[PDB]
Enzyme design. Structure first.
Site, PDB file in Angstrom:
ATOM      1  N   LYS A  72       0.841  -1.184   0.000  1.00 48.45           N
ATOM      2  CA  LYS A  72       0.000   0.000   0.000  1.00 48.45           C
ATOM      3  C   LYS A  72       0.884   1.244   0.000  1.00 48.45           C
ATOM      4  O   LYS A  72       1.832   1.336   0.797  1.00 48.45           O
ATOM      5  CB  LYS A  72      -0.921  -0.002   1.222  1.00 48.45           C
ATOM      6  CG  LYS A  72      -1.972   1.083   1.259  1.00 48.45           C
ATOM      7  CD  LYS A  72      -2.967   0.808   2.366  1.00 48.45           C
ATOM      8  CE  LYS A  72      -3.857   2.003   2.638  1.00 48.45           C
ATOM      9  NZ  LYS A  72      -5.285   1.601   2.510  1.00 48.45           N
ATOM     10  N   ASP A 124     -11.016   5.154  11.967  1.00 45.14           N
ATOM     11  CA  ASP A 124     -11.174   4.969  10.526  1.00 45.14           C
ATOM     12  C   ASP A 124     -10.812   3.572  10.044  1.00 45.14           C
ATOM     13  O   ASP A 124     -10.789   3.337   8.826  1.00 45.14           O
ATOM     14  CB  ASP A 124     -10.368   5.996   9.720  1.00 45.14           C
ATOM     15  CG  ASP A 124     -11.039   7.361   9.668  1.00 45.14           C
ATOM     16  OD1 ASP A 124     -11.808   7.687  10.596  1.00 45.14           O
ATOM     17  OD2 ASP A 124     -10.801   8.112   8.697  1.00 45.14           O
TER      18      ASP A 124
HETATM   19  O1  LIG Z   1      -5.486  -7.142   2.210  1.00 42.09           O
HETATM   20  C1  LIG Z   1      -6.127  -6.769   1.222  1.00 42.09           C
HETATM   21  N1  LIG Z   1      -6.293  -7.639   0.129  1.00 42.09           N
HETATM   22  C2  LIG Z   1      -6.973  -7.233  -0.926  1.00 42.09           C
HETATM   23  N2  LIG Z   1      -7.517  -5.939  -0.930  1.00 42.09           N
HETATM   24  C3  LIG Z   1      -7.358  -5.123   0.123  1.00 42.09           C
HETATM   25  C4  LIG Z   1      -6.664  -5.546   1.182  1.00 42.09           C
HETATM   26  N3  LIG Z   1      -6.652  -4.561   2.074  1.00 42.09           N
HETATM   27  C5  LIG Z   1      -7.325  -3.537   1.571  1.00 42.09           C
HETATM   28  N4  LIG Z   1      -7.773  -3.872   0.359  1.00 42.09           N
HETATM   29  C6  LIG Z   1      -8.598  -2.995  -0.578  1.00 42.09           C
HETATM   30  O2  LIG Z   1      -8.212  -1.558  -0.516  1.00 42.09           O
HETATM   31  C7  LIG Z   1      -9.342  -0.815   0.036  1.00 42.09           C
HETATM   32  C8  LIG Z   1      -8.905   0.377   0.919  1.00 42.09           C
HETATM   33  O3  LIG Z   1      -8.712  -0.037   2.279  1.00 42.09           O
HETATM   34  P1  LIG Z   1      -8.231   0.996   3.425  1.00 42.09           P
HETATM   35  O4  LIG Z   1      -9.452   1.156   4.524  1.00 42.09           O
HETATM   36  O5  LIG Z   1      -6.975   0.544   4.063  1.00 42.09           O
HETATM   37  O6  LIG Z   1      -8.061   2.454   2.693  1.00 42.09           O
HETATM   38  P2  LIG Z   1      -8.561   3.839   3.368  1.00 42.09           P
HETATM   39  O7  LIG Z   1      -7.541   4.487   4.234  1.00 42.09           O
HETATM   40  O8  LIG Z   1      -8.934   4.764   2.097  1.00 42.09           O
HETATM   41  O9  LIG Z   1     -10.005   3.621   4.142  1.00 42.09           O
HETATM   42  C9  LIG Z   1     -10.069  -1.896   0.827  1.00 42.09           C
HETATM   43  O10 LIG Z   1     -11.400  -1.491   1.191  1.00 42.09           O
HETATM   44  C10 LIG Z   1     -10.083  -2.959  -0.243  1.00 42.09           C
HETATM   45  O11 LIG Z   1     -10.760  -2.442  -1.367  1.00 42.09           O
END
Ligand SMILES: O=c1[nH]cnc2c1ncn2[C@@H]1O[C@H](COP(=O)(O)OP(=O)(O)O)[C@@H](O)[C@H]1O
Ligand SMILES: O=c1[nH]cnc2c1ncn2[C@@H]1O[C@H](COP(=O)(O)OP(=O)(O)OP(=O)(O)O)[C@@H](O)[C@H]1O
Ligand SMILES: O=c1[nH]cnc2c1ncn2[C@@H]1O[C@H](COP(=O)(O)OP(=O)(O)O)[C@@H](O)[C@H]1O
Lengths: 296, 316
Positions: free
Chosen positions: A109, A231
């Site tokens: 990420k 969050d």
């Molecule tokens: O471990 C993973 N495997 C596959 N996809 C993931 C994983 N973790 C996150 N994602 C994807 O990325 C999106 C963003 O997650 P996150 O809550 O960390 O971002 P944010 O800070 O914008 O809320 C998740 O809702 C999902 O779509």
């Protein structure tokens, strides 16, 4: 021969960097424990080649690994061998800013500098928490944190164990937040979708079986809230076996997977974990109530 | 597992750097041949750790490797494996400005910045020489060239194969150049453990290396074309180094250290080594090679000539 050929130069710097640092680490003895300085430490390397090795890498880049000793220990406590980590990042370019290793085992990420500082604020307490539950948790499993600088601009990455199986294709996804607001999914985003609270609620999907998951989750969220974290979202993924071995996974590789009960109408296997824990006490309670209502 | 432990931060950095560059080179395909770019290429890396991995390496150092690909090619042509080179530099620290790898195979000399530049001016023609003689030279065989930065200051280092055997002790040594000038080992020098004897010390001693016909021609033809090449580059001050090994004396030294509880060698490995004639008084083994060739410009034509006319009858 690890030629670092990738979809764009920062990916090949990433591959080069994870390779370099993991070898470097292979030459550093694992200590009898980690130390305060290990939580304030970093590796930094700067490369200027000139008419050399330019076919796939840049000729000028920088790579920094944050607390390599702490993240290597975390890697051990999470059950990841270092050379498997290295192979999954370096054998073939990561794909799709949010990336998966070519083998869908780990996600990379892109992350704000504020999030890196948050990681440093929490990391000692996070490590002791991994220690105390022997890695049986549903928080993201942090496996490395790196800062790449290439062509001028810096980029921060957090590597973590994927919530989903690297084998079984996931058929539906839900980002539950426990909102007192109504986080629905956009028509734009609806046209594989990503459904939030309102849509798992007005969808009728239930998850069937048993209950030691509630113990693990409540421990995790009491911890996060006791550290002023908000969050975060619980991420749920359904794989309908019937589409077409099936419902066959390795519980040591998909440490989040879970088989349905005979109750479940469709032939489903679920994956669930907490995500995005880098940034409120009421948040934990509402989150836990909504995640409570979900089992059968 | 390699700690890179050494008595000086400089040596630790040298081990880390040879390790790193050979490993990096491991992932770079071996070209069909060298491009001109490779002869002006370099690879830099600058390390600044912090509270991490400071047991042996400094936290802050830099490491530059010159024309890494043409020296890899040279290594190949000289019959040296890259893995072997790396291991003899990194398995244990080198020892004794001059250094020796722990296994007495390769030599690391600290040189000047102008030595580096001179090597650059000559490198293209040197590689083509090494190519057109299959590595059959008395000239130093250049395996790598580096620039270390420890604690703020740069050191230039040139790695070369040892003219001496890694197994067979050397009991006498000479450094000769054919100078008309009286070149003799100082009373200070003439009283070391293994003194480094100059020309007059070789003459007043009546020393005669007797190698027999066939090896004497390998030698004389190698020396002829080597120093003609050096002359054409206007290079001077090169010396011929000769080490004498006393077969019987080594047999006795080994017997006296085994009491404290053949005479052969591999020319795959001891490339400047020659046996003594069958009908020769003492059974000896000699090592002879030209050294110190990174200095450009009586005339170098004159230096070629005087050098050759001297070493011509160093042996017979
Ligand atoms: O471990 C993973 N495997 C596959 N996809 C993931 C994983 N973790 C996150 N994602 C994807 O990325 C999106 C963003 O997650 P996150 O809550 O960390 O971002 P944010 O800070 O914008 O809320 C998740 O809702 C999902 O779509
Ligand atoms: O490719 C080359 N072809 C010819 N000659 C070269 C080449 N490469 C270097 N030389 C000379 O090699 C000596 C060592 O000098 P160097 O450059 O390694 O050190 P820098 O000048 O970079 O100084 P810095 O700011 O980093 O402290 C200097 O005569 C430099 O001109
Ligand atoms: O390959 C080697 N094996 C053993 N001794 C060597 C070797 N190369 C150089 N030496 C020793 O180092 C001395 C100085 O050599 P060189 O003429 O290259 O350095 P310089 O710049 O001080 O004149 C040689 O005369 C010899 O005593």
């Amino acid at each position: 021969v690890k030629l670092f050929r990738a979809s764009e130069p920062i990916l090949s710097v990433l591959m080069w960097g994870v390779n370099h640092t993991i070898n470097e680490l292979s030459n550093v003895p694992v200590p009898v424990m980690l130390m305060p300085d290990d939580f304030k430490a970093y590796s930094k390397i700067k490369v200027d080649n000139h008419l050399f090795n330019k076919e796939n890498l840049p000729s000028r880049f920088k790579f920094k690994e944050y607390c390599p000793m702490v993240f290597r220990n975390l890697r051990e406590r999470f059950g990841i061998d270092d050379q498997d980590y290295q192979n999954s990042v370096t054998r073939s370019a990561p794909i799709n800013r949010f990336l998966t290793t070519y083998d869908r085992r780990f996600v990379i990420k892109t992350v704000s500098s504020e999030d890196v500082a948050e990681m440093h604020n929490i990391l000692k307490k996070y490590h002791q928490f991994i220690v105390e539950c022997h890695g049986n948790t549903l928080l993201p499993q942090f496996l490395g944190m790196y800062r790449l600088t290439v062509d001028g601009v810096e980029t921060y990455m957090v590597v973590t164990r994927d919530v989903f199986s690297h084998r079984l294709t996931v058929h539906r996804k839900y980002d539950l937040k426990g909102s007192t607001v109504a986080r629905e999914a956009s028509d734009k985003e609806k046209a594989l979708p990503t459904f939030k609270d309102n849509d798992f609620l007005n969808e009728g999907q239930k998850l069937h079986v048993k209950k030691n998951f509630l113990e693990k989750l409540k421990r995790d969220v009491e911890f996060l809230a006791q550290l002023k974290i908000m969050d975060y979202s619980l991420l749920v993924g359904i794989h309908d076996v019937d589409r077409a071995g099936p419902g066959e996974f390795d519980p040591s590789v998909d440490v989040y997977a879970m088989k349905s009960h005979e109750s479940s109408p469709k032939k489903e296997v679920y994956f669930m974990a907490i995500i995005d824990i880098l940034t409120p006490e009421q948040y934990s309670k509402r989150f836990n109530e909504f995640m409570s209502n979900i089992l059968t």
